[PDB]
Design a protein around this nucleic acid. Structure first.
Lengths: 165, 131, 224, 197
RNA sequence: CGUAAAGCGCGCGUAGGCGGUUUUUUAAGUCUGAUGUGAAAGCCCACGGCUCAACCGUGGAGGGUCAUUGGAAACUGGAAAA
């Protein structure tokens, strides 16, 4: 799925909609769609999508698949640990942490994302493609390949506070 | 003909991480063993064991992995490479990945991590990031 | 459990093509065919036997696939012996990741059958009775006699990966304990709990279904 | 055009009390099409609506508002806080937030007048930046007209970073405030994002 | 830079660019320290005055592929030996 939990708080939030067609002889059968992200803005977020003949159906189905895929998102000081670049299918992306008091600076979709994972001050510029989907998949690809000081110094035989960001 | 040894070492290393078998072989050199000791001091390595025969090498390494088998680095590369050599001061140096990884560097007094190079206020010729 | 003279029984696998992941299991290839080594196998049997036994300590629930032939007679048999639900044939789309339907499925069973009491067969005309009888028989058939999974599984046992690779991946979405027999020509790291021994042989599979039926049964008559 | 507007219709749009003036019809929104359903909100509308929701507070304008914002761009600690406190460490605020009025504009016509005396000195501009280690007074000539002591008498409120002497009409600024010391609290992040694009 | 614009038809070879290992040395490159200079005004930071601001001043830091000079030798470089 993997492991939707409906137990935390939630804030569904919508990114787009298309009107998408399948032509069969005679008419043009088309099916509105939408992407969604869902998080607690307290340490959990993930996307979800679906298609239907109508919006409420689509968005709801999207949300039922939305909770089913998640990332833990190691956050620190209301901020991400460090800077990366995400990449997936030419929808590259670049983040960087910040002096606080800034507020998230980025584009529409990615703003809706990180605003829903409870991150406060961070800097970015989207890159490569402007398509809404693989943008996000870039984001969560990077956040899935991301670490905090406890995630690491465990591995290395030494320990934090001779080393820290 | 090998234009560069850094490529040999770091590429056999990455190619060995993507496949996850522990041990690995390579012809030796002065700098290679120096930095390999640093990586052992990082924690990115378990162990090394030198061995000798006609004439160089083989600097044999045994790599390290979690119990859940996550690769301990994510990434790697040099910087100071042929054609465009590069340098940096003691003040100017980078703090990679705001503090997690490292940036190997050579000094007038030896090859070291970047941290000892800013504490000492001695810069030098950078070699490689790793993180 | 295991003893090495029970591992003098297990022999060989198929020799068409073989995962290079699994040379570590090999003792050495001879007579034109690959074998697995056995000294490790006993350790792994101990560890896994112990694991599934622990899953039965907590009041566990477990599945048996027999969709592979030359196994099924031992699958419902050793499963019904242990007293856990089973399958020995068709794994239709979803039974571990399509939960929302299985309710309707076994509920279809409990629905149609009882009406054989209040007057069903040859009280309604030729056209329906002939339909429902066949629906019932094929239902039980390509399902099996399972009607009992009411809380969805928390561990699985299986006859063979490379046939049921689909179903075990449907477990992989459910990040569960998987365990089962390992022909040397199957995805090794697709399961956390290998049992590196042959699958084709009747005595091998009977022995493994037998002992694992025993470990389960112990853990279930273990205070659950 | 610092202030010549109704200034109620604005607070009818945004969903805040003031300003102004006073406190039915507020569940609606302005205009012919007003009462009905309307557009949704973009992200832009939120940070923007926040901006105006701080702008018509002090009645000021944008070119002054920005210049404030980026003189907060110099100093250390967080940013939006410094913009708030420096925006409410002004002369109109230290007047009305001391309780010498019923609204924010009463202070403005009080000080263009020159009635108050920053450190015992005539000043005609509400755009002064008030500081600690000061007094503030009322041109003792005029501490008895209809408006003032009509307003002085009631204890509207007092923050602990302001002192006050109702007998003397003497305030004096005390500590660096924060929003947790300043009512009419906000979000800062949304408005700082607005001056990105 | 397979197919979307984009690898010459292919070769011989000059000039140039890049260069295996160990040891010893040199100090041009490099790093570091200092002396001078890098006008003033301006930019940025701190302060004070024009009622505040603009503005003005003060003082700070800042800036060179810069010259001179004392130190370090792992790396590039030159010389020598294997």
């Amino acid at each position: 799925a993997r492991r939707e939990e409906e137990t935390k708080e939630f804030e569904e939030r919508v990114v787009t909609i298309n009107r998408v067609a399948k032509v069969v002889k005679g008419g043009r059968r088309f099916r509105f769609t939408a992407l969604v992200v869902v998080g607690d803005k307290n340490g959990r977020v993930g996307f979800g999508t679906g298609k239907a003949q109508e919006v409420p159906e689509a968005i709801k189905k999207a949300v039922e698949a939305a909770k089913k895929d998640l990332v833990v998102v190691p956050r620190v000081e209301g901020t991400t640990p460090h800077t990366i670049t995400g990449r997936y299918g030419s929808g590259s992306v670049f983040m960087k942490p910040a002096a606080p008091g800034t507020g998230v600076i980025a584009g529409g979709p990615v703003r809706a994302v990180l605003e829903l994972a409870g991150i406060t001050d961070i800097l970015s510029k989207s890159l490569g493609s402007n398509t809404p989907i693989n943008m996000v998949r870039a984001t969560i690809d990077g956040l899935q390949n991301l670490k905090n000081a406890e995630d690491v110094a465990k591995l290395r035989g030494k320990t934090v506070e001779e080393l820290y960001n | 003909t090998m234009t560069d040894p850094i490529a040999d070492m770091l590429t056999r290393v990455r190619n060995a991480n993507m496949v996850r078998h522990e041990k690995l072989e390579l012809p030796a050199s002065n700098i290679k063993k120096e930095i390999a000791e640093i990586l052992k001091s990082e924690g990115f390595i378990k162990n090394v064991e030198y061995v000798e025969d006609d004439k160089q090498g083989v600097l044999r390494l045994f790599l390290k992995y979690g119990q859940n088998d996550e690769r301990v680095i994510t990434g790697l590369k040099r910087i100071s490479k042929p054609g465009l050599r590069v340098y940096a001061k003691a003040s100017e140096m980078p703090k990679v990945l705001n503090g997690l990884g490292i940036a190997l560097v050579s000094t007038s007094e030896g090859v070291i991590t970047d941290k000892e190079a800013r504490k000492r206020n001695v810069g030098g010729e950078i070699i490689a990031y790793v993180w | 459990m295991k003893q090495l003279l029970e591992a003098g029984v297990h022999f060989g696998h198929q020799t068409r093509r073989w995962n290079p992941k699994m040379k570590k299991y090999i003792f050495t290839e001879r007579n034109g065919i690959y074998i697995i080594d056995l000294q490790k196998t006993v350790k792994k049997v101990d560890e896994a036997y112990n694991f599934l036994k622990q899953v039965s300590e907590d009041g566990g629930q477990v599945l048996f696939v027999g969709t592979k032939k030359q196994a099924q007679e031992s699958v419902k048999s050793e499963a019904e012996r242990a007293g856990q639900f089973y399958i020995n044939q068709r794994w239709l789309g979803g039974l571990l990741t399509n939960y929302k339907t299985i309710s309707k499925r076994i509920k279809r069973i409990s629905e149609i059958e009882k009406m054989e009491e209040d007057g069903l067969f040859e009280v309604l005309p030729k056209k329906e009775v002939v339909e429902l009888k066949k629906e019932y028989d094929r239902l039980i058939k390509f399902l099996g006699g399972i009607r009992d999974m009411k809380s969805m599984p928390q561990a699985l046992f299986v006859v063979d990966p490379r046939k049921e690779r689909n179903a075990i991946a449907e477990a992989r979405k459910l990040n569960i304990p998987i365990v089962g027999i390992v022909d040397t020509n199957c995805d090794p790291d697709e399961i956390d709990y290998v049992i590196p021994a042959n699958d084709d042989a009747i005595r091998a599979v009977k022995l493994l279904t037998a002992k694992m039926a025993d470990a389960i049964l112990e853990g279930q008559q273990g205070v659950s | 055009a610092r202030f010549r507007g109704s200034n109620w219709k604005k607070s009818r749009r945004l969903g805040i009390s003031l300003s102004g003036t006073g406190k039915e019809k507020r569940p609606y929104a302005p205009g012919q099409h007003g009462p009905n359903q309307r557009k949704k909100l973009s992200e832009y509308g939120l940070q923007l609506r926040e901006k105006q929701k701080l702008r018509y507070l002090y009645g000021m304008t944008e070119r002054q508002f920005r210049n404030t914002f980026d003189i907060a761009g110099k100093k250390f600690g967080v940013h939006g806080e410094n913009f708030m406190i420096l925006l409410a460490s002004r002369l109109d605020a230290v007047v009305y937030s001391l309780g010498l009025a019923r609204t924010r504009r009463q202070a403005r016509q009080l000080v263009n007048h020159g009635h108050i005396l920053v450190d015992g000195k005539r000043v005609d501009i509400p755009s002064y930046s008030v500081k600690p280690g000061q007094t503030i007074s009322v041109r003792e000539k005029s501490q008895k007209l209809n408006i003032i002591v009509e307003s002085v008498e009631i204890n509207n409120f007092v923050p602990e970073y302001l002192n006050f002497d109702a007998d003397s009409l003497t305030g004096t600024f005390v500590r660096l405030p924060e929003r947790s010391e300043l009512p009419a609290e906000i979000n800062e992040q949304l408005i700082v994002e607005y001056y990105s694009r």
